[PDB]
Enzyme design. Sequence first.
Site, mmCIF file in Angstrom:
data_model
loop_
_atom_site.group_PDB
_atom_site.id
_atom_site.type_symbol
_atom_site.label_atom_id
_atom_site.label_comp_id
_atom_site.label_asym_id
_atom_site.label_seq_id
_atom_site.Cartn_x
_atom_site.Cartn_y
_atom_site.Cartn_z
ATOM 1 N N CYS A 43 51.918 43.785 2.773
ATOM 2 C CA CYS A 43 53.229 43.725 3.355
ATOM 3 C C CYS A 43 53.173 42.790 4.670
ATOM 4 C CB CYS A 43 53.921 45.148 3.572
ATOM 5 S SG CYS A 43 53.648 46.243 2.432
ATOM 6 N N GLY A 86 52.958 39.899 0.132
ATOM 7 C CA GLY A 86 53.713 40.699 -0.734
ATOM 8 C C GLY A 86 54.655 40.159 -1.736
ATOM 9 N N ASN A 132 54.659 47.805 8.133
ATOM 10 C CA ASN A 132 53.445 47.340 7.655
ATOM 11 C C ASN A 132 52.395 48.238 8.045
ATOM 12 O OD1 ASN A 132 51.165 45.767 6.761
ATOM 13 N ND2 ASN A 132 51.024 44.390 8.579
ATOM 14 N N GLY A 133 51.637 49.154 7.329
ATOM 15 C CA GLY A 133 50.621 50.244 7.424
ATOM 16 C C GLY A 133 51.047 51.265 6.546
ATOM 17 N N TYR A 166 39.629 38.613 3.625
ATOM 18 C CA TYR A 166 40.535 38.233 2.485
ATOM 19 C C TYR A 166 41.773 38.176 2.729
ATOM 20 C CZ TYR A 166 42.781 39.400 -1.712
ATOM 21 O OH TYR A 166 43.861 39.649 -2.571
#
Lengths: 465, 465, 465, 465
Positions: free
Chosen positions: C1, C27, C102-103, C242
């Site tokens: 996200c 996302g 985001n997490g 990545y």
Amino acid sequence: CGVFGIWGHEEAPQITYYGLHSLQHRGQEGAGIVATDGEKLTAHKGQGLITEVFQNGELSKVKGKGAIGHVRYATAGGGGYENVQPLLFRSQNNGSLALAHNGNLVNATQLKQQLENQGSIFQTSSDTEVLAHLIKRSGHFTLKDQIKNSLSMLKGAYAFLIMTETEMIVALDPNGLRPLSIGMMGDAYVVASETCAFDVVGATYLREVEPGEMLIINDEGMKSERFSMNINRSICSMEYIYFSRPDSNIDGINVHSARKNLGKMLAQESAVEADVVTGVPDSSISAAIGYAEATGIPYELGLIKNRYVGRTFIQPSQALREQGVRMKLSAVRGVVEGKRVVMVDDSIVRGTTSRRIVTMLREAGATEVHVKISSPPIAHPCFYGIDTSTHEELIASSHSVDEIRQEIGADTLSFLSVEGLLKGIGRKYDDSNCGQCLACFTGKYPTEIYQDTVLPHVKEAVLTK
Amino acid sequence: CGVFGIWGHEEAPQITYYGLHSLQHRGQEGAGIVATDGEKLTAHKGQGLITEVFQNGELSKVKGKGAIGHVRYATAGGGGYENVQPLLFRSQNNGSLALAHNGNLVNATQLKQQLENQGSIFQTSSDTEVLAHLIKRSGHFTLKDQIKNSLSMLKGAYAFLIMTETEMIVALDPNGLRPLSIGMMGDAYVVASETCAFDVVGATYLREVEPGEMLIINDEGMKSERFSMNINRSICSMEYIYFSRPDSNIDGINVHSARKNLGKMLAQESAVEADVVTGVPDSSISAAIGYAEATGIPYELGLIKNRYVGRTFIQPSQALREQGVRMKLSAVRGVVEGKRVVMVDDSIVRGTTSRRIVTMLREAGATEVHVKISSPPIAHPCFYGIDTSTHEELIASSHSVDEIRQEIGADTLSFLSVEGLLKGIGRKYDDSNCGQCLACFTGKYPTEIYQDTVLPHVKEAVLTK
Amino acid sequence: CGVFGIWGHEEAPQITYYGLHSLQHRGQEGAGIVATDGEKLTAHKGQGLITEVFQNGELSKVKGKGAIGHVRYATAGGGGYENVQPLLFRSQNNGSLALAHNGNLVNATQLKQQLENQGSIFQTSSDTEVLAHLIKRSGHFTLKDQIKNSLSMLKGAYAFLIMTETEMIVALDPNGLRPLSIGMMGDAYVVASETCAFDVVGATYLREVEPGEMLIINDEGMKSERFSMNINRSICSMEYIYFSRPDSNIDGINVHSARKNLGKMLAQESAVEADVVTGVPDSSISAAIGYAEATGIPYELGLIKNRYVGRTFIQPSQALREQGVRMKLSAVRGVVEGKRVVMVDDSIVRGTTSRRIVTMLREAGATEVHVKISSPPIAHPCFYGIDTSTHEELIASSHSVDEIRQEIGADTLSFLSVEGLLKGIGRKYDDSNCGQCLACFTGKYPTEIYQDTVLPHVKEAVLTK
Amino acid sequence: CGVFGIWGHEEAPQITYYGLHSLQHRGQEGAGIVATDGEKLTAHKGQGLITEVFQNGELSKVKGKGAIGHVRYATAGGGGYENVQPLLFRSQNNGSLALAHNGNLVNATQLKQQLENQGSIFQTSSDTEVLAHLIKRSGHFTLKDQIKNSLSMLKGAYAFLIMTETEMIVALDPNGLRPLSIGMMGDAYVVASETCAFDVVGATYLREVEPGEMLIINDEGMKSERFSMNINRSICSMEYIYFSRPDSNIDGINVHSARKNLGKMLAQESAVEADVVTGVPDSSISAAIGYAEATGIPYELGLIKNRYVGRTFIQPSQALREQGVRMKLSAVRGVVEGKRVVMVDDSIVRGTTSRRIVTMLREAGATEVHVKISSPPIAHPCFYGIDTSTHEELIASSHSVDEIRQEIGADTLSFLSVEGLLKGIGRKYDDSNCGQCLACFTGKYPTEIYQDTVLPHVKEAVLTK
Ligand SMILES: Nc1ncnc2c1ncn2[C@@H]1O[C@H](COP(=O)(O)O)[C@@H](O)[C@H]1O
Ligand SMILES: Nc1ncnc2c1ncn2[C@@H]1O[C@H](COP(=O)(O)O)[C@@H](O)[C@H]1O
Ligand SMILES: Nc1ncnc2c1ncn2[C@@H]1O[C@H](COP(=O)(O)O)[C@@H](O)[C@H]1O
Ligand SMILES: Nc1ncnc2c1ncn2[C@@H]1O[C@H](COP(=O)(O)O)[C@@H](O)[C@H]1O
Ligand SMILES: Nc1ncnc2c1ncn2[C@@H]1O[C@H](COP(=O)(O)O)[C@@H](O)[C@H]1O
Ligand SMILES: Nc1ncnc2c1ncn2[C@@H]1O[C@H](COP(=O)(O)O)[C@@H](O)[C@H]1O
Ligand SMILES: Nc1ncnc2c1ncn2[C@@H]1O[C@H](COP(=O)(O)O)[C@@H](O)[C@H]1O
Ligand code: SF4
Ligand code: SF4
Ligand code: SF4
């Protein structure tokens, strides 16, 4: 299908959109507008409704002071974007040409065969295209005369609007099978298949287009000419019975009124003693009103039509349908229960709708259902338009009125006599038929039919399914 | 808005889709279905017409033997996806709850205030969400008793449908303001806002939901409980006058018939001598049929409605409008020209539509336009539903009948009397009002309205524009 | 996200759309923007690409000078609209609150079980909803103190942007597991998950948000506060290996350059003799470039990825697939034929892609295929975000590096060591792990993982399929 | 534009979807597929990406064992449905024909001018239509022999795929200006503009179509006849330089390798002392790697391209743009700040992209930006394809390399030499040009250009805008 054109209006494509929209009942399978500014031709078209085609974004791309448009029918819904009219042909260092048609040509098979041997390739399966090839091969020295003589080579039903950068040419076949009317809107001229589009647009109606007449309309004005003096007036009778919107006047006879008289005529031909008159939503409302009034049996709403059924509506599985699930029309029990219902319907073509309707009306509790049709039986094939034809069977081809009464299960079934129909619509044209085409009913066509002549629908190209 | 539910049908999302589509006139601003299989609730909803929302590919996701659906109205067409119902609340280790409502909680601002203070956060502006906070914070010991006592904290109008994995609860308010009926389809039980949804789906009507009654439907069967024995029957008079589908019967009185009698009461209260009776398409056909029969003036189709105007239809510019371009309705010159018309409409709220229809009617040639309305003047606001409210101005707050008459431009204007309305509908209930809510007309609301009470539209969430 | 936010720019929704557009790689299953003008929050969100969500017509409604946006990752592509963010709560006479995360909160279940016990109903399975409920139920006197004290109760990973009509609060967890950075774009402060977003929007980088820091940005300026002083820095190692876009810089280390250095590490840890080096399209280009540069073997484009595959791409059948039809990636035979390839990828998670790629490289004529992976094996689960976890079986749990080599069919298989990984990225932090989370490689989590800690995807809502 | 066809596979439309998909980069303005089962041609076409055109439902309507497909380019994204190919022409009682073209007939105006003087009307502005009219009007007796002699009249670039219900005829012009390659997939013969299509689909390369050759593929197998002996080999140099995907082999030479060698030539003709080599994401990646390798300077990702920019992407305003908002390309500060950068691009055509790129690079902190181009200046027009021409001003028509260096802002600017180019690509064709078309660089065309010849784009039909 239906056509609309306007020459001399700075907003002519916006007006063609509303005009075409009043004629939206005449075909929902494609729509298109071509417009000229005098310099060049701009256009937009596509499959589906005028709203579906012009979502908008698109009405902005069509600008001009003159435009023609077409609303198209397709039996098998699809047929291809190819056949969405107007068709447009371009020739650099010679001009653009746009054409729209409502009708069916009986010798178009024959003509395409001759044309292909003169070296012609066809891309659409439209009769409009056949005309394009004929104008182009004509040896006369003027567009007016090349068209004028190419119409001489065509047999059948046709209403053509043709438009280039600089004039609109309108032509009506010598039988005048299809309606075309001229109205005025300021100093703009407008041509439409039905007068209701003038009502909608603010145009004052001027007059019909004579059978065999061709009008050239441009900045100088309207020029009339007559490509045929050998005329036989025989308008499609179904225009007055089912196809036109109720507020159109075909030859000055308003369609609601005419239809109401067919209910009146039907009453005087065949009364019954019963408790309720119901029409069928949208097709036989006016005739039902006329039959109820002539008869004194109260007019009721005993069938309701769902307003949101569309191509996007999912149809019920055969299982749900045998479980009781209705789709576009359901009988209303609160009106018909324990009553003797007469159901006035405008026509039986296949027999399917009246059958389903007698059943619904019985399950709601009608104790008697009498069926009255403001038409003669429709026995013969129509060869004059996709809209006026069907690719499915005519049960009158094979059945008698007692066998049809029996198939639909009416307690009684009646059709109007040809005599009552003509009597009912009320034209003043001296002859047997008062200037109307009766061939579906009677078998006698106002046109030579060829051995090669295919049923209109047979001219299809895209599969869709 | 309208709700539909079915417990015990192996094809419940499909049946709910046909059920909601016959209720599509009740709201075109969003639709949804939540279905259960005993295990988990699966659901689909979104803004728009039912057919826009389940284009399909989507009804195949929602599966189960129980299912509830809602069709929604929003004045400011939009409101927000969030307000599209059913609302689904989830809790792992305690269950899913799905809720659909038709009515307006008159004490919801007050209840939301008290709720945010006890720690509540609100995601929608739906009353449905207020009811679900009250069930969770209820200390009663069983789902049934928690809903039963949260219902007691609510004031206003409501038909609630609630569904979890295993049961369906239905509740109707103590006035019975909004309708609800129960039917059976084989072994399944179905609930709908109007009976026309039973007709379509093939379901047998059993009875209405009683004011103050709650049904618990599940695999054992249907259980009834009364959550209030303190009831005051007052159904929406406008359900009968305008809002319901013509084939629905409200409290056993058929809606077409009722409206037709309202035309017959108007004829005897105010019969005029004219040439033609015309209804306005779709909203006052039946009252005009009855007025006409009552009066012996023939019923004509003097006005037409375009079947394809919509949210994608490009509205004509102000310019085009004063040039004479029509949008959804036009008068039909072939019937009204040279005639004295009575235009019968069900209600005048803002006075916009009849001012337009009398004008068009004069433009088309009517020598007289007499407007007969089958309602008392609507002078007061409705707090019992968005669908039965307007956010624009009621001119009978300010105008006397002659002031309205001058404004709309009619030759004459006549409304029904409250005595004629209650007489026309024919409800057999012992009280002044025969069990109807006459508040918009009289000022006597049957519920208490608070100083904090907002009018239904005020509760909106999304801008849209 | 990915989250993006900017306060004090009049074109803020548009800037948020471009900022989010550069983080689209984080996302693809939903996008949303909320903006504030000072009086009201306006919002638009939906599933799919930013471009899908904001066709436009839509971005015209979100108007304001502050905006927050989020881009969502959903594993089983769906989740449902309800989980698309930012979440917006409204409360009359108390303010609206929009939140984007985001997490992954490792103790969300425990907290949710508690909140339901205090009377909370949840509509989404969003951790953002947990935070929304904790703020309201806080006793404290000011949003700042209510947030500060709620964050204390949260366990797991979290980069939060919160927004009201008048201020933005940004907060990062005590491990700084997820990146956030601050930038300045004129007078506006911008906040984003990665710095490429700033490059794209013309904002100047300022600094990284500290672990345990919350910032209050409003028209007075930005204020920093510390809500937790007990921080143990552990950034996601996969952000660097990545997940982040190559032009981003995590703690001032550039992602392409770090990855290229991981390519140079792997060459000194494992240099093999071969002819051509190839990375995999898009995920391991920088590392492949580093391994070739390090080695003196030429870097080639030996695999291609089709730019036009997406959700609307029809997958080959099993049949067509074994006939040989490729989907997103194919080996370029013209580079690899009869050549000894080393194929460098960033990580092996499930084993699938590496098996597919080595089969194709041999099908295109390669004589040897030596896989070199710039990561230790990934053997343990990630509890710190959907974007970094998998629902599928990881083969380094069950397989030794020789069994994984036999499975993918490589001639050799080498993984980066944790010491090479740490030396390769080059973070200057004093501790064992250079300030990095390596849990997925080593088994040791930087956080307490509960018996109630579910894997992030196990928090789904909608079925979709 | 690109063409793909397959004869003799039961799943041939699907194979073509995939084939056409690997060629999607050759044109994005339309896609079409025509299949034959032995009895009839079915097609589907439309504007947009293949995935857009065949959303699916649609691909399944096309069925057969032979198929041809085209992917179209249109300079101004538009042109209209008419120009989307394969064009299909039907004749009842004479068979159907489908045609796809990749090239440009330099004499088509002359040819249309003749055709029109013989009675031909045209509906599209495609050259495929010109050939169609010419085959039908050919005096010859067999379809083979008709085509054979029509091709003899054509001047310019052309790769034609013709298909009837029973055979597929392939033909390549006498200079082989555009590529066509034949491959085999089982017993099905397959033909495509680039060989990547064969890789992607599992077709094994067989040989290129010879210039001036025509092949007749049908169930008997494949037949070959040379419709021209008088051949002059001149393949497009820009196919090698830019247009082909990097895994195609043009004339047995791999495009990525040839491009990497052009990078090595430019290195030995213009070496510089700088610290970073960067390519421009996607067009000059291979050459940039070649240059770095030959130069020993490190190859870095100094520019990222946004994977999600599209037609649907809302372009930034001028003000947003000069505020610093990027569109498809950004420069990476973490790689280029304080560095001397050589930026290798494949070609310069209007001069816009490289001014744009050199600025971004300076805004990222680069000290030197030295632009090296692996092409000569494109100072002349292409008259052989819309894909290889630009309608906009070529700046080497008016500017010298130093005027160009100043315009684009380069520290230094270099272009490859024609010699270095012929040498880099490596064809050993004896003749001065190694069998390549170099007209855009030298002014020497391999064909006679007429005074009537227009630039490809000028043949445009729909306005779009
Ligand atoms: N706007 C309209 N108002 C009333 N009837 C209409 C309208 N448009 C078309 N019609 C009638 O609708 C009938 C066909 O509808 P249906 O048979 O219900 O599908 C035709 O007989 C038309 O004359
Ligand atoms: N040619 C036609 N094409 C389509 N609908 C027709 C046609 N003729 C009449 N209709 C309608 O079809 C009804 C008869 O339906 P059916 O008996 O099922 O063919 C009539 O009442 C009309 O409303
Ligand atoms: N399918 C239907 N058939 C006939 N009338 C309808 C139908 N659905 C709703 N109505 C009536 O149409 C009116 C609303 O239409 P309108 O006011 O013309 O938009 C209401 O008075 C409804 O009772
Ligand atoms: N509450 C309401 N909301 C929507 N339409 C209404 C309402 N009540 C009546 N109608 C319609 O409004 C018409 C009166 O329109 P107007 O006078 O312009 O407000 C009636 O014929 C009904 O079709
Ligand atoms: N615009 C971009 N340019 C290059 N690489 C990108 C871009 N956006 C994301 N990535 C990288 O691409 C990889 C994911 O793409 P893929 O492996 O092709 O699905 C990750 O390693 C990202 O860092
Ligand atoms: N957590 C993850 N989820 C999704 N993609 C990932 C993840 N970690 C790595 N990747 C990508 O997946 C590849 C390994 O794929 P596979 O072995 O088939 O699971 C690497 O090149 C990465 O691009
Ligand atoms: N014929 C062409 N049409 C379209 N793009 C081209 C063409 N030739 C080259 N290209 C691209 O345009 C770039 C040059 O851009 P510009 O100088 O702004 O036209 C090269 O790197 C190519 O990617
Ligand atoms: S006030 Fe009027 S519209 Fe409202 S509930 Fe009562 S009768 Fe209905
Ligand atoms: S366990 Fe792995 S993917 Fe998860 S936060 Fe840590 S390094 Fe990242
Ligand atoms: S002029 Fe240039 S782009 Fe055109 S065909 Fe020749 S080499 Fe190709």
